Amino acid sequence: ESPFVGNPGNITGARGLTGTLRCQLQVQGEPPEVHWLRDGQILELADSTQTQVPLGEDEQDDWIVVSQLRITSLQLSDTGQYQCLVFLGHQTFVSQPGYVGLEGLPYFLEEPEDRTVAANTPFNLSCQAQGPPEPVDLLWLQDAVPLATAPGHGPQRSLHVPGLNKTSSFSCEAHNAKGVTTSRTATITVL
Amino acid sequence: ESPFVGNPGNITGARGLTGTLRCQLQVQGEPPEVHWLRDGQILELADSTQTQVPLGEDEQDDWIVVSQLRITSLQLSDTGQYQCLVFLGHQTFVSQPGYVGLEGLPYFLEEPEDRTVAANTPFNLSCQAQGPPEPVDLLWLQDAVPLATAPGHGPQRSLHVPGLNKTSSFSCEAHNAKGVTTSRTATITVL
Amino acid sequence: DILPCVPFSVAKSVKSLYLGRMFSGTPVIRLRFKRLQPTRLVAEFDFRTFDPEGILLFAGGHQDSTWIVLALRAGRLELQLRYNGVGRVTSSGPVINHGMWQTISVEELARNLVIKVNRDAVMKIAVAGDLFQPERGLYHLNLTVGGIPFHEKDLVQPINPRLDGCMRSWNWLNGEDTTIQETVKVNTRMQCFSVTERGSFYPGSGFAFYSLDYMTWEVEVVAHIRPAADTGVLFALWAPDLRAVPLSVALVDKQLVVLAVEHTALALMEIKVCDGQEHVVTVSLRDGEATLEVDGTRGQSEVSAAQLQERLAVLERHLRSPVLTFAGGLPDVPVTSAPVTAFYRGCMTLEVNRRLLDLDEAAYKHSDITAHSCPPVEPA
Amino acid sequence: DILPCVPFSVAKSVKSLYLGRMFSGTPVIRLRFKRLQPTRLVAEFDFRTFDPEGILLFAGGHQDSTWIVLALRAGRLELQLRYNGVGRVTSSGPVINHGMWQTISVEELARNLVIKVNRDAVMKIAVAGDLFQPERGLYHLNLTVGGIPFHEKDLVQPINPRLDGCMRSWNWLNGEDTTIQETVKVNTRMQCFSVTERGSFYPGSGFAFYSLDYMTWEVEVVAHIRPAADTGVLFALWAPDLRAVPLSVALVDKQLVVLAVEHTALALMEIKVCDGQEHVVTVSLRDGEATLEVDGTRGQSEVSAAQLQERLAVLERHLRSPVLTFAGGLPDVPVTSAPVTAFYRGCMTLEVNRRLLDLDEAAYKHSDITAHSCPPVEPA
């Protein structure tokens, strides 16, 4: 049968998060080195830690191996189906799979910038923001005031201001299933 | 009487060690700011953390103040008698004292240096090391071999080597009541 | 001497911290940090509550300088920011007042301010500056728990700071420095109920009262209760000047509720107060009518529509003046001022005039009364 | 069926780790670290022991590359270093084999290597390089506990790796990653005795034996014991080829010790084995004399100096050949091969010929026998 007894679990979180996957097999004599497979391919450069515990009286009896892959600053690429692999002779063995997915608050790509415009003149501000998860609804604010009933409603990614007879400020919330992340407060200076 | 109820303790350790002293008084209404005295003088720039807990129903009943001074990287100067100080009106109050002293393994000041000497020629190596605690006994080693029965015995601070017909190496242990710290291994290259 | 015919699990939790201990909205704990070098703010703690509104913690400097407040409003997390005059307030995340424990934390990661519930982020707000402020070659920062250093009127969006929630497993700016955990051990009054069910709990030692208007005139009271004593004032009206008890609902023995105007009854109704079950006492009054129901079952009056009038007439005359509404008890009045005058001991939620009474909104709540949490009925 | 007339507190400790589990000196745990970036080694753990000599942990690469070993020798901490061929060994600190718990830790602070006992430093050795080694775009490092990856003969200063000590509250390179703590829960055989007193404990299921020379010829045995069964072989000599039991001391019932040569007794002596007290059985033999003492009180022989000679004559002839010295039991021999043949169950320290027997030095110790630790006598 399959040497495994414990299969990888699942880890989902925001970018940056460090977490760990772990499988634990039991073999007969001198344990094999356990490798990690991500999306069916071999993970050549990854932080892993194998713990071997001899159950017998010699190194030729039963052993308990437990390998845990650790993902440090969780980014996008690290996303996928992960599984353990051990070679028992010319034969090969794989663990059930585990999946790791990225999922947190909105990430800004563009935020309202500071500007200094002539009075009663038109101009535009921008506000992009990616997920996952998607979709992400935007929502502007003027002098700390919503410019729409709720997120997703009103201008988004690009807000056109007809004119300003005095210095004002704009923010830009970004919402998604996880929560909300507000942008920096841009200050428009009038002359 | 004295508002205090808890007086500073004592913290002794090696250089670098971070530790904390703490006194805790109980007063009537709006607690006073608690200062720290070291060697009878006022500690103007020091990390401290006061915790105030109201015992009554208003801010004019009994309070429990607890202040803890924290010494980060314990160095030599931080050594002394410490005590808490609170002003209750034009009057003044001080806590019992607590003392913090530096005490660890030997610290090197000079270690055997690498050299390249002509064969069968004389030369000298050096090896200083301070405490506290003192006294610190030295002890050389040649090619990983003691040059004396025990610490304090044999050459110290300065070892004279008459000559070497082949490249050799010297170490220098340094002992004191706390334990021992061995120096780097110097390699003398012969020509 | 009256005794508890149905005791509750008055089991505290020495490892916890009660944020609602003081009705005066004073913070239950105040920290003052003096640090040698720049310092990132980081607070984390386990928190449990039913109260939908309240203040978790304040962190920052002077009222009109720069600070942050993390609060509960509408049962959700609210964050108010003032970074020098510039007000701001955000709200998101899941429901918090679900009665289950959880983990909340505020921190200054990057140039933003991050808030997390169960190690997962819910709010990321961009700020332009640090909470710790430079004052005399040292950085400072104050931090208060369960309340703020100033008056709610000066916040950014006012809120009733009073929060009946529990806290534990705290960590202020990294450190286990068991200093709080120590005094909280010695002061039971600072620990919370180990297990908390919904409702408001009266331990039978004080009362709470409001300044409610009843002007024609109405008086509808709905009191979901779970007694722990055979006698005690549920609801009541009080006229200060003449120390009179215009109206009042209470428990007595045998074993029954009793509506009344001043010294005279007006109706009764039997109830099995000692079965630890939720009963729904309800009283409805106005000129002409004066009925008392218990679980939808009226009781026979003690009047005669003739006497009942030489009462409601007095009552409606009392309402023509200021009247304090008491819950759970009555100030020091002569024993012959009403049918019952001893304090009620148990769980009780009051609806007065289609409005729900929030003990945090009262004009005065005795301190040992828990605004939004009742201990469980110890099954024997 | 014989039963334990004096049971011991066979209470393990699920949170611990037994380093002496395997007589074969194989490490009880092997860790293999693959890390993306440079990594500082840091190991810390709580440790308790009586054994004066043993190996705590190995950390590093290949046998002749660069590694470190932290060990116990003479009851003190020994540190061996090999940073590419360059051997080195240091020793200092307090006594460790005092039977009380403590905290030991190795780490690569600065460009030195620091060792601490109870968060206080005892040894600071200067090294020139890092333990983690670069191999294929990754840094690696192996770490074994209670033993090494190779043969003691290849160390820097050989030492008998076998260490009967307990470990708990461990932390390898920072992490609580409860992986060890898990299997140790399921395998009692890996946990230690909750309380440990001095001596060597035989659970009565195996034995240990040595190849000792007795050549005239002497045979002095001193056995401090604390039985837990009325019968059992304390000391014994065995002749492999003929499966003979030349000499043997044991317990039987009533209730007494018994010296003997092959199938025939030679002397007896009563003892109260079931009072959990330390007795000092001592046997002295050589041509002419053959006495047995128990706490300094000889017993009357069963021979006659005439028969006693048609024995010591056989014995000294047996010693003219290879003879295995057994402690606690005997291989599978016919019941009529000696007075007693069942295994001894209890605490017992043997002195054979003015020399003290170290069960770690034996040629074979059954695994369930504890080299330097006996469980306490459960007071009933």
Ligand SMILES: *[C@@H]1O[C@H](CO)[C@@H](O[C@@H]2O[C@H](CO)[C@@H](O)[C@H](O)[C@H]2NC(C)=O)[C@H](O)[C@H]1NC(C)=O
């Ligand atoms: C932190 O809070 C303390 C209150 O404990 C503030 O201290 C007061 O400061 C004002 C003005 O500096 C004084 O007039 C009061 O007498 C002070 N009270 C005490 C007990 O010293 C302090 O100013 C606050 N610091 C910050 C972060 O702004």
Ligand SMILES: *[C@@H]1O[C@H](CO)[C@@H](O[C@@H]2O[C@H](CO)[C@@H](O)[C@H](O)[C@H]2NC(C)=O)[C@H](O)[C@H]1NC(C)=O
């Ligand atoms: C760490 O320990 C492992 C486990 O034995 C060592 O791996 C062996 O390395 C040799 C030489 O490269 C190989 O021939 C074996 O096949 C390996 N065994 C396994 C199970 O893979 C490894 O050498 C050690 N790492 C270092 C550099 O110390």
Ligand SMILES: [Ca+2]
């Ligand atoms: Ca509230």
Ligand SMILES: [Ca+2]
């Ligand atoms: Ca040993």
Ligand code: NI
């Ligand atoms: Ni092959």
Ligand code: NI
């Ligand atoms: Ni003055």
